[PDB]
């Protein structure tokens, strides 16, 4: 089996919160400015009244925590500035304050259990649909009948999937930043983190996860970096899994009244803050996250076009309806679709050279081991294990890979 590294537990490294995010939402919006992110965010902000004086509750151990506190206070100050203006601007350029100049820039780890938990959360369904019925595909021509049937069965099973929400979240924020990176090169622009869903009842909703502030972005090449500060709401207390949050300063910024299985309960609302950066090429990929839906669909269609060659008839219906196989090992056809999707999305969210190395070399050891398995290599192990350092996503697949070696 593979040897995973020893060390302190791995920490979160995505460009935004995943299972820990928190949404401020408005239903079927129709205010003077429905569709301009700044107007949407403010209207989501004013939905919430439990704000309170913020303080640091889990410090970033390598950054200057007074500057993170001041930056969040500045956001509320400048948002409150917009409140006082007669009209609402289309965008907001933050004052180039001391805290923002500092925050915008102007070793072995062990597998922690939070990343498997993220992956499990990415496979669940939500109350809300995140994509339209004809979202998947780029076809110039109308789709033939069999393709259409598969595309609609598959969309039924993943439209509400949590991984799909990560897709649209990511596409939104990456489009917003990439565009801002070009239209406001010298500004510290305030960029809402938005997404849009439809409820089980049919209502269009708008969600605010928090805010980005981008720094100077004269991105001349694909690999040039624009730094940014992320500020994300959450009900997750950082003191439970502090190792998850090494890269973050976390503030407590309000209290929130929630329906629960015990009735109404008041929980603190937190605000996860970190500095971070991205590049033109990374943001272009982030805008492409819908292809995760298409790539997941194809892996599904592959299993069907396989079964269909063996039975001389189209097995699309009998596969999705679960009518030779005798069940579905994940539980249901639906969980197989969402599982494939979640893996593809997390490949995107945690894209790394260590993942591209591990993916190639481990497939080599895979075909060798199951060749040996049903019929009865030391440098290869070093290639694969040269990828096992500190990435939570690489390490978790390596953990998964070792299960396959036992069964």
Distance CA 119, CA 117 (A): 5
Q: In angstroms, what is the minimal distance from the CB of 258 to ligand 6AY? A: 18
Q: Kindly state the number of chain residues that form the binding site for ligand 6AY, as judged by CB under 6 A.
A: 9
Distance CA 161, CA 122 (A): 7
* Interaction pattern, residues 204-233, with ligand 6AY; x per rule: CB under 6 A: ------------------------------
**Using the rule CB under 6 A, is 76 a contact of ligand 6AY?**
yes
- Stretch (H or E) spanning 232: strand 225-234
For 77-91, letters b (16+ CB in 10 Å) and e give eebeebeeeeebeee
**Using the rule CB under 6 A, is 45 a contact of ligand 6AY?**
yes
Three-class DSSP labels, 55-92: EEEECCCCCCHHHHHHHHHHHHHHHHHHHHCCCCCCCC
CB 247 within 8 A of CB 12: yes
**Using the rule CB under 6 A, is 257 a contact of ligand 6AY?**
no
From the list 3, 51, 61, 66, which residue makes contact with ligand 6AY (rule: CB under 6 A)?
A: 51
Q: In angstroms, what is the minimal distance from the CB of 254 to ligand 6AY? A: 8
For 9-19, letters b (16+ CB in 10 Å) and e give bbbbbebbbbb
Kindly indicate which of the ranges 50-58, 64-72, 193-201, 371-379 contains the residues binding ligand 6AY, using the contact rule CB under 6 A. 50-58
- For residue 392, the 8-state DSSP code is H
Q: In angstroms, what is the minimal distance from the CB of 55 to ligand 6AY? A: 11
Distance CA 393, CA 14 (A): 10
Q: In angstroms, what is the minimal distance from the CB of 43 to ligand 6AY? A: 9
Distance CA 123, CA 342 (A): 6
Q: In this structure, what are the phi and psi dihedrals at residue 235, rounded to the nearest 5 degrees?
A: -90, 5
- Comparing CB distances to ligand 6AY, the nearer of 42 and 122 is 42
Kindly indicate which of the ranges 51-59, 85-93, 149-157, 288-296 contains the residues binding ligand 6AY, using the contact rule CB under 6 A. 51-59
Q: In angstroms, what is the minimal distance from the CB of 73 to ligand 6AY? A: 9
The radius of gyration of the chain's CA atoms, rounded to the nearest angstrom, is 23
**Using the rule CB under 6 A, is 46 a contact of ligand 6AY?**
yes
Distance CA 383, CA 365 (A): 11
From the list 7, 27, 61, 80, which residue makes contact with ligand 6AY (rule: CB under 6 A)?
A: 80
- Comparing CB distances to ligand 6AY, the nearer of 73 and 101 is 73
Q: Which residues bind ligand 6AY (CB under 6 A)?
A: 42, 45-46, 51-53, 76, 79-80
């Amino acid at each position: 089996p593979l040897r995973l590294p020893d060390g302190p537990p791995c920490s979160q490294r995505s460009k935004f919160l995943l299972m820990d995010a928190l949404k401020l939402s408005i239903e079927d919006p129709s205010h003077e400015g429905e569709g301009i992110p700044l107007y949407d965010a403010i209207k989501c902000m004013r939905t919430f009244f439990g704000w309170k004086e913020p303080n640091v509750v889990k410090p970033h151990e390598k950054g200057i925590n007074p500057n993170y506190l001041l930056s969040w206070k500045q956001v509320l100050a400048e948002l409150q500035d917009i409140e006082n203006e007669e009209k609402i601007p289309r965008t907001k350029n933050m004052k180039k304050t001391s805290q923002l100049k500092w925050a915008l820039g102007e070793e072995l780890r062990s597998l922690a259990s939070w990343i498997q938990n993220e992956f499990n959360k990415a496979c669940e369904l939500t109350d809300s649909s995140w994509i339209e019925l004809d979202e998947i595909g780029e076809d110039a021509a109308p789709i033939e009948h069999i393709a259409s049937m598969r595309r609609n069965y598959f969309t039924a099973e993943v439209s509400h999937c949590r991984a799909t929400e990560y897709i649209m979240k990511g596409v939104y924020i990456n489009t917003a930043l990439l565009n801002a990176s070009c239209a406001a090169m010298d500004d510290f622009q305030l960029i809402p983190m938005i997404s849009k869903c439809r409820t089980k009842e049919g209502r269009r909703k708008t969600n605010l996860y928090g805010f980005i502030i981008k720094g100077r972005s004269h991105l001349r090449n694909d690999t040039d970096v624009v730094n940014f500060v992320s500020m994300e709401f959450s009900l997750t207390d950082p003191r439970l899994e502090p190792h998850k949050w090494e890269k973050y300063c976390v503030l407590e910024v309000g209290d929130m009244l929630l329906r629960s299985a015990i009735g109404h309960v008041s929980r603190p609302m937190f605000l996860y803050v970190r500095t971070n950066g991205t590049s033109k090429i990374k943001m272009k990929w982030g805008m492409e996250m819908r292809r995760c839906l298409l790539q997941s669909l194809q892996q599904i269609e592959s299993m069907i076009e396989a079964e269909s060659s063996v039975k001389e008839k189209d097995m699309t219906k009998e596969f999705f309806e679960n009518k030779s196989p005798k069940g579905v090992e994940e539980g249901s056809i639906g969980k197989v679709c969402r599982t494939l999707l979640a893996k593809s999305v997390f490949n995107s969210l945690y894209a790394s050279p260590q993942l591209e190395g591990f993916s190639a070399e481990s497939r080599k050891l895979l075909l060798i081991v199951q060749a040996l398995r049903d019929n009865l290599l030391g440098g290869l192990y070093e290639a694969i294990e040269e990828c096992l350092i500190n990435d939570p996503w690489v390490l978790l697949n390596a953990s998964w890979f070792n299960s396959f070696l036992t069964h």
